[PDB]
Amino acid sequence: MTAASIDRELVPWSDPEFRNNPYPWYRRLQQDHPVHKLEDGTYLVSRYADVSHFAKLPIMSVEPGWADAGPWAVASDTALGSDPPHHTVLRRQTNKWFTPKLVDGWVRTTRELVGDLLDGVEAGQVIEARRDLAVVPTHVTMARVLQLPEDDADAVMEAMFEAMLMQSAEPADGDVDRAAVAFGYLSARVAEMLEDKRVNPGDGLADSLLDAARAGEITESEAIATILVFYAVGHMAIGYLIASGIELFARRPEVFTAFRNDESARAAIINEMVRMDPPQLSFLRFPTEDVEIGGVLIEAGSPIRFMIGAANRDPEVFDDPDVFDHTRPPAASRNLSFGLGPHSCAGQIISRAEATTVFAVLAERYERIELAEEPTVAHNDFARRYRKLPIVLS
Numbered sequence: 001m002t003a004a005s006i007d008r009e010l011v012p013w014s015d016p017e018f019r020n021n022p023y024p025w026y027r028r029l030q031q032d033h034p035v036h037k038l039e040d041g042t043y044l045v046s047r048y049a050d051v052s053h054f055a056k057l058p059i060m061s062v063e064p065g066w067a068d069a070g071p072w073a074v075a076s077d078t079a080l081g082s083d084p085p086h087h088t089v090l091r092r093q094t095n096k097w098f099t100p101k102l103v104d105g106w107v108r109t110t111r112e113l114v115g116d117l118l119d120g121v122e123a124g125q126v127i128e129a130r131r132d133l134a135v136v137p138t139h140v141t142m143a144r145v146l147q148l149p150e151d152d153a154d155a156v157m158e159a160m161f162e163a164m165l166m167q168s169a170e171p172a173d174g175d176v177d178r179a180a181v182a183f184g185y186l187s188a189r190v191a192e193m194l195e196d197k198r199v200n201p202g203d204g205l206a207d208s209l210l211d212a213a214r215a216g217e218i219t220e221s222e223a224i225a226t227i228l229v230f231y232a233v234g235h236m237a238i239g240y241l242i243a244s245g246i247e248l249f250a251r252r253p254e255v256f257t258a259f260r261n262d263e264s265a266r267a268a269i270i271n272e273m274v275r276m277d278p279p280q281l282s283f284l285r286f287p288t289e290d291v292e293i294g295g296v297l298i299e300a301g302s303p304i305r306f307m308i309g310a311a312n313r314d315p316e317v318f319d320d321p322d323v324f325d326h327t328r329p330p331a332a333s334r335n336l337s338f339g340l341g342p343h344s345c346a347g348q349i350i351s352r353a354e355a356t357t358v359f360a361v362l363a364e365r366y367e368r369i370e371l372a373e374e375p376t377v378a379h380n381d382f383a384r385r386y387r388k389l390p391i392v393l394s
């Protein structure tokens, strides 16, 4: 045995079966190696109590990983790659556009587009739900908040699929070059859109970010990067959650019937979907001083990968963690899928309302969702993805 063969036994990042369902390997990792140092120097932290306490500490920086991330170093000029104090100012620029009463307006776009798609079908028609119920409605919702052209969902989704390959812990040969191609496309399309906006300003979130850079609250590079990331990821993790929830309502029709029959249960159904199938499985921090976790001394500047998916199945927190149950008590009703601490997801309020909206419009019209064929997926060790989800509604 070697350190490398031990790591492959515990977390075979490239293995198709581990990509399709990592949860059996997470259970072993969490039981026997809850703070595990990989041969590359990354520490894997997988117990809920340890991720929830340590990952949000102020000593946990987000700067080093994104700064060294090649094509992804665009995130250094956003909240995702910025520490406080300037992190607070970058987040106020977007948080102020996604308060609950503003989100109630933005998700009218999601409702209108789902209603258009459903009005157009014949009875028994196969709907490709990944594009038509998840990616297009969410892309256009966010493009309309930004006040950017809304017609490019398919190329933006292809670009982001290519850009996410290199976020694997074991990128394939060529994956960093695929991300440079993808970001080259998105940066050129955003530059063309913002040149049009300079000449003809509107009053959306992209104009608010450009005004904040002109006022000196953020830099021009931070305005442009934040517009690019909200535009490009508006469809992505939220499109995965909507497709995952549609597959759950087909495989477990009694959950869709409960969603139909009890409005007061709808948030908790969605949150149980989110606990069980997080679209992002982990995230990195780099502590600014030495820190002991699980009796292991981690030196300043080491990479710590907090394993969200593994934590969300911790039987110290959730009884029968592999069973879907939307009636868990208040102390076992929350999860780490939108992160925590200052970098908790800047899309959380709009994402929960977009999923609520797509599921509510389907429940207004239909009693049952069925899979027309098995779904086609393209998961890796970092991010989950559907390629195709053909369904029939009745």
Ligand code: HEM
Pocket (backbone or CB within 6 Å): 078, 079, 080, 081, 091, 142, 229, 230, 233, 234, 235, 236, 237, 238, 239, 241, 274, 278, 279, 280, 283, 284, 336, 337, 338, 339, 340, 342, 343, 344, 345, 346, 347, 348, 350, 351
């Ligand atoms: C409208 C869609 C979304 C947008 C625009 C969006 C945007 C962002 C941004 C800008 C951040 C960084 C915030 C900061 O560093 O202060 C973030 C963090 C995060 N998001 Fe989202 N997000 C979206 C949907 C989702 C969904 C649906 C999930 C999972 C259910 C998700 C999971 C996460 C996680 C786990 C983080 C924390 C990453 C870290 O701490 O390093 N996001 N999101």
